[PDB]
Every structure is written in structure tokens, then in C-alpha cells.
Amino acid sequence: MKRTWQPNRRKRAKTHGFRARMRTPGGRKVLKRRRQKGRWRLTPAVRK
Template sequence: MKRTHQPKKRQRVKVHGFRARMSSPGGVKVIKARRRKGRRQLTPTASRRAA
């Protein structure tokens, strides 16, 4: 049986990336909360090649 986690860089960015977050009001709240908390990385980012 195949494992459930089959990571793909492009898909990760499309779903959880900065532009995806900024496209909805809830996502903007997430970014604001992470900025307020002082997170070093606001969203998962991929290399130029993957995205």
C-alpha cells in the first residue's frame, strides 16, 4: 500500500503559499497572525524551478 504523503513542491506552494493566502480574507488573517507572532517564515516557499 502506498503511503499517504506524496510531497510535491508546486502543489504545496499553490495551496499554502503566500499568494494563495493573500487571495482570501482568512488567509490574510493567517499572514497577519504569523507576522504578529514574529515567525521567520510566513509561508512555505519553493525554489524558482518548482513554482
């Protein structure tokens, strides 16, 4: 049947993207934490 993952590049970037994180205080701390842990990518990759 219809599973839960229904990829949508516009949905992905406008929800978990870089510019969506820097706007809110929580999304900034998400960026701080991942930038602290040493993640290779702080935001989901999507070729647009």
C-alpha cells in the first residue's frame, strides 16, 4: 500500500533544509549540535 516515505525535494528542503534551521532558535541549536558532533553534513542532501 502507500508507505510513509514519499520523497519530495521541495518538501525536504523547506522543512529540514539549512535556511529552515537558521530561522528558528531550535533549528540553530540543531546546527550547533551537529557542528559540534562533527557531522559531515548538517542538513539532508537533496540534488534539487
